[PDB]
Amino acid sequence: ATDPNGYIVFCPCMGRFGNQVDQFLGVLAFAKALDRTLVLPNFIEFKHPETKMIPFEFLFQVGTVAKYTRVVTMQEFTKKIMPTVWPPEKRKAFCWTPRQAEPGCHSKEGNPFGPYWDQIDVSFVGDEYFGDIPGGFDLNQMGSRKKWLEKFPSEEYPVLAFSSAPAPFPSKGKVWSIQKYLRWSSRITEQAKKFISANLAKPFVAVHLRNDADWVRVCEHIDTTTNRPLFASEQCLGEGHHLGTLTKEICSPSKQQILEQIVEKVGSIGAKSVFVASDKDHMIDEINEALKPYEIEAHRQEPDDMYTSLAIMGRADLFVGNCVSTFSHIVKRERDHAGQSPRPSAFFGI
Amino acid sequence: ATDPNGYIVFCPCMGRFGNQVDQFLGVLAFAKALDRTLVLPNFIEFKHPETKMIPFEFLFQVGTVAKYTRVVTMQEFTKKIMPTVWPPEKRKAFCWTPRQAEPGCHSKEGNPFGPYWDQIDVSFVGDEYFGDIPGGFDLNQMGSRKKWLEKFPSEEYPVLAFSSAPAPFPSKGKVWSIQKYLRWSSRITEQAKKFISANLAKPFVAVHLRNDADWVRVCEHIDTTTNRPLFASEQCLGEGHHLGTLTKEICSPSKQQILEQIVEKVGSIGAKSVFVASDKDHMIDEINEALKPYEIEAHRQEPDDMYTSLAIMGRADLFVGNCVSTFSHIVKRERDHAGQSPRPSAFFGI
Ligand SMILES: C[C@@H]1O[C@H](OP(=O)(O)OP(=O)(O)OC[C@H]2O[C@@H](n3cnc4c(=O)[nH]c(N)nc43)[C@H](O)[C@@H]2O)[C@@H](O)[C@H](O)[C@@H]1O
Ligand SMILES: C[C@@H]1O[C@H](OP(=O)(O)OP(=O)(O)OC[C@H]2O[C@@H](n3cnc4c(=O)[nH]c(N)nc43)[C@H](O)[C@@H]2O)[C@@H](O)[C@H](O)[C@@H]1O
């Protein structure tokens, strides 16, 4: 059959993988609160000549996420549910308020908005708005699940379709534990285990080095006097930065600081190898020189596969991440929540 | 001196004049609720080779709006307040949440967003978000004025700058009475009085005929089974359309229906002339033929000045508007609220 309560489908249409997963956590909680089945999103990759949509199940296990709330794959939704439950004629786009491009949602305007819905051959014929609902999409505390059910009954609205993820960004502390239900696919887990077995004598420290030019730019624009959250910064500084001040040294550690701190961590755990995940400079030669007194080496994947890297860092004896990066935030959350007890993590500059 | 509580400045960056005034009502109430002075917006005109910014005071009286809440002109703000209170270095843009274009507000992206802020020589250097405040910008019922003051103290944030008006669209019934405080400038009022004296024997019926091609398109896309608000439709059908169903005949009356209803209204009040305001077809010859049994004529401005037209319709013995048009909504509100008692109005198809 199909879910009489209906469905939610959305585009993780903001940012790269870290941003997508960060919003996806909130969407999961949203769908559960509305008691509608979530269509699992295609994730989006930008480092190709065109945008690339990746099936949820290529990366994560459907069985594990199902344990949190009802889900269906994108394949099952588009091939089996959509044609009868949600024909082209009632494909309404949902958004907060009508917007300047006729004022509406404009769901397929720009990238990745267009290519995402085009990939599943979906166009919208009308708009629905939810900005007038008391509490927005924040359904637990400021709880308005009754108001959503009342405004969008399942019979008239079997599918709620959002071109922006109906979840805060950055994520709220309350949804971080949902990372427990995102388990890497068998394929990725096995690649992680093989790389570790072949290359990383235990215990190993894994580090995330986020250092490409766009990043240095983002860090150097930190306004230390307003001290607002920046991407995942609350993962190390607490909600609203109650623990301290985000600095440039935390956001973008110098090469010398990275080395000092790696060597320090290797010493604290008696590490027998280091794993490096980087968006650009893995600093393998520099780290190896710094590691010579310990007669151990740093290792990376060539090429660096971002998903296997995340998985390897989740398995590390110690993880040292970048506090600002939502990419590091994935690891921090998995390390915190995948098991019954937290595996330890640290952050550069902290 | 200057307001120690600080300022709000915003772009009425959605839609044409009717949409701008409709949001501007909500902004006025918002500013009053936060007890900050509102910088009066430049209104925006699109029917030129480029976008044109119009000073508030060219159209409306500053003295009258001041009676509702503290305001300052755009000229006074940019020439006298801005340089010391809000230098280039602390010009932060405010928005609901970071968005896909680095994720931020992107306040000057597109039109009229760019040209509006460029007109007052303003660029933004950082972003602030308010989506995390319980209740959004809806400060009376769901009241979060304390939360705004706490998050944005006046000393660190002397100017709250919004590239989208911090007000619902379409407007909520609760702000419609604020139309009382928008009185046409002396210049427009006098033009209205002269046109009436010279051309419109009293009592006169004024009609708004909204009939250009973009409009017929918007009307023909009405989904009668979801029966959601469309622009100003709640002005005749009540909040959430509790009074009835929006139809195409209401949104886009036929020529025959327009004539029938004009003739009917002329008969009910013993009218001695008709005034027509139109975005395209004033139907002067057709209305005159239909009016021959009454030996009266229909009259229009050549060219049709939209502000003087609004003002003339506000002064009419009877107004017959278009329920869907926010342009008609201005007149309906002024007729309802400018005086101590409502002047009568009606709507085609109602
Ligand atoms: C500047 C801002 O940075 C934010 O990134 P941040 O939170 O680190 O995290 P993400 O949203 O994942 O964006 C960073 C992307 O860069 C690549 N990347 C980062 N670290 C690694 C790595 O260790 N290995 C590999 N192979 N790739 C990496 C990868 O595609 C990743 O999704 C953005 O999402 C914002 O939208 C904005 O662009
Ligand atoms: C299709 C939708 O229609 C909405 O318009 P709607 O609510 O009627 O009201 P407005 O937001 O004013 O947009 C209609 C504009 O068209 C012109 N116009 C309409 N009626 C008259 C008139 O009687 N005389 C003159 N001179 N000009 C008129 C004028 O520029 C007016 O601001 C838009 O604001 C939405 O953004 C969207 O475009």
Swiss-Prot record, chains A, B:
A single BP term in Gene Ontology: protein O-linked fucosylation
CDD domains associated with the record: O-FucT-1
Annotated GO MF terms: peptide-O-fucosyltransferase activity
Root EC class: transferase
Major subcellular site: endoplasmic reticulum
GO annotation, cellular component aspect: endoplasmic reticulum
Top-rank taxon: Eukaryota
Entry keyword Glycosyltransferase: yes
Residues bound to substrate: R16, F17, G18, N19, H208, L209, R210, T326, F327
Keyword Signal in record: yes
Localization per Swiss-Prot or TrEMBL: Endoplasmic reticulum
Pathway: Protein modification; protein glycosylation
Disulfide bond entries: C11-C13, C95-C105, C219-C251, C236-C323
Consequence recorded when altering R210 to A/K: Abolishes enzyme activity
Record text on subunit structure and interactions: Monomer.
Function as written in the Swiss-Prot or TrEMBL entry: Catalyzes the reaction that attaches fucose through an O-glycosidic linkage to a conserved serine or threonine residue found in the consensus sequence C2-X(4,5)-[S/T]-C3 of EGF domains, where C2 and C3 are the second and third conserved cysteines. Specifically uses GDP-fucose as donor substrate and proper disulfide pairing of the substrate EGF domains is required for fucose transfer.
General remark: Manganese is bound to the substrate GDP-fucose, but is not required for enzyme activity.
Name by which UniProt lists this protein: GDP-fucose protein O-fucosyltransferase 1
Gene: pfut-1
